[PDB]
Amino acid sequence: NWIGDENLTGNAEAPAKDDVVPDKNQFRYQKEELAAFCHFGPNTFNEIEWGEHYGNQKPSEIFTLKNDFDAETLVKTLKDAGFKKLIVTAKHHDGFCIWDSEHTEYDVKASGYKNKNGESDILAEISKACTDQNMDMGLYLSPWDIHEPSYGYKDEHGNPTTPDKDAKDYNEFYNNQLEEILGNPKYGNDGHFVEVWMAGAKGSGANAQEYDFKKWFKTIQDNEGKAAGYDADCMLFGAEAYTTVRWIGNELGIAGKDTWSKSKVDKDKNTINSNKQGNATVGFEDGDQWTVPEADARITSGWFWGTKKNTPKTMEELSDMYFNSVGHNATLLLNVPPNNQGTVDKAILDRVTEFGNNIKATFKTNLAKAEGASVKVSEVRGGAKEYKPGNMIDDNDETYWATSDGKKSGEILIDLGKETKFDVVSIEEAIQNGQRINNYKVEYRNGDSGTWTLLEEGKTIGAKRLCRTSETTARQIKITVGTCDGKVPMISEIGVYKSTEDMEKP
Ligand SMILES: *O[C@@]1(*)[C@](*)(O*)C(*)(*)(O*)[O@](*)(*)[C]([C])[C@@]1(*)O*
Ligand SMILES: [Ca+2]
Ligand SMILES: [Ca+2]
Ligand SMILES: [Ca+2]
Ligand SMILES: [Cl-]
Ligand SMILES: [Cl-]
Ligand SMILES: [Mg+2]
Ligand SMILES: [Mg+2]
Ligand SMILES: [Mg+2]
């Protein structure tokens, strides 16, 4: 006996939230799904991924951009394709700064680069374009610095020594560059960054350098967090127990099929465990800190553009990436690298646009809301209109279906209203109240009776579960979701889709 939206006159309290919930930045990021990376700097000009070998070459020799950087085309293309954030390499491992920095002469101001307006600040140009399009921003500032003399332990003569005799403290240099960028309103979206990216990667032979994450965290939040009057702390990647955005554990855009947005942290020992299983961090059902699972990936073969690494991935590769990241409760952070002309190759921009168009066309028509279709449930929390099944098809992440206290599992019946072709089932857990679902099942059949065919079963839902199959014909789809004893499931949205040709399962 299936329950619809009609004649619900009951009362219920909201389900208790989980102990561990996303902050407002983490929740917005998980619902944005798509972010863009922008790697740009001397490596763009030198056919290399790690700029380890510049030595004493001048900024003007290694950063040779001769045209005004085209931030407007990049940002417009990304915004039109559905990307909601741009994370910029202000400084890569080479140490070259693409903003005008008073703390170093190893920067774009020293390179001789000037835009149409006589300014020398690529990070400011990108920030202006992002601000104009209301594109949120992240700041990538490499902890490892191959150039900066304060990096490592060196005496007043520049020769290796012990930490007590180190003449210049890299932790102060890095902190000062954080303050210089984050404290200046010409950087960010209207002065604001929502994510700081601290790469953990470092050369095997590089100098030892202990990082003062506590110091840097304070500078970040005093500029971009609750202490600065924002509604959440600025998200941090690569900051030990301060981490609020975790690395998915590979650079291929792949999240584990059952991914939890939670890690185990030790604030005293400054550690984080995100449960590495095979090639991905799958998190913990009982994790004590929300971490957004962030799958960083390259649209080309490298992070930097180059003449031998400018062919963009195919739609087959990018569709697989989408379903294995966004469809597995992870964000996709896709790099789109500018070229040595300060533009983006037309082939790369066209593939970004094609990828965005395919995602939009795939999710345009929710077959759970087509003519004659209906969404019903096995039970409605308190028989209350506040938890009605139509809350799963209202395109409002704040409204959800849930069951009554004592009912840890429920079923959703989607009647498509006729025999219907589909290949994607979409399920979104109301993660503002926690990630708690630990079993799901999706089944389908012809007609309105008889046995069910299994589409998919697994553990997690989280921000988004996409179940992608081969083209299937059905009249009805049944979704089962369950949590542990003493909790109830909360589903904010569901959908059924037929993907575009270039998003179909191979
Ligand atoms: O290069 C590379 C590095 O190493 C890492 O850390 O990250 C990524 C993104 C890139 O940048
Ligand atoms: Ca030093
Ligand atoms: Ca700021
Ligand atoms: Ca809803
Ligand atoms: Cl290389
Ligand atoms: Cl209840
Ligand atoms: Mg949404
Ligand atoms: Mg420009
Ligand atoms: Mg300077």
User: How do the residues of the chain divide into helix, strand and coil, expressed in percent and rounded to 5?
Assistant: 25, 25, 50
Q: Are 380 and 388 in contact (CB under 8 A)?
A: yes
CA of 494 to the centre of ligand 7 (A): 11
- The stretches of 65-169 forming alpha helices (DSSP H) are 71-80, 108-111, 122-133
Whole-angstrom Cα distance, residue 45 to residue 339?
A: 8
- Tell me the C-alpha distance between 248 and 275, whole Å: 10
Q: Of 232, 296, 286, 281, nearest to 264 (Cα)?
A: 286
Q: State the resolution, in angstroms.
A: 1.5
Nearest ligand to the C-alpha of residue 334? 1
Do 435 and 454 touch, CB atoms closer than 8 A? Answer: no
Query: Which domains occur in the chain, in start order?
Result: 25-363 (3.20.20.80), 367-497 (2.60.120.260)
Pocket of ligand 1 contains residue 201 by CB under 6 Å: yes
Q: What atom of ligand 1 comes closest to residue 142's alpha carbon?
A: 6
CA distances from 426 to 291, 295, 388 (A): 22, 19, 18
CA of 493 to the centre of ligand 4 (A): 5
Q: Enter the tokens of residue 301.
A: 């073969």
**The pairing of beta strand 262-266 with beta strand 465-482:** unpaired
* Tokens describing residue 461: 């839902």
Interhelix angle 346-362/315-325, nearest 10 degrees = 50
Nearest-atom index, ligand 1, CA of 335: 9
3, 116, 1: which is closest to 392 by C-alpha?
Answer: 3
CA nearest 82: which of 123, 36, 39?
A: 36
Bridge partners for 3 per DSSP: 377
Q: 181 C-alpha vs ligand 5 centroid, how far in Å?
A: 29
Distances in whole angstroms, Cα of residue 308 to Cα of each of 42, 52, 141, 382: 16, 19, 26, 62
Q: Which residues pair with 375 in a beta bridge?
A: 414
Position 373, amino acid: A
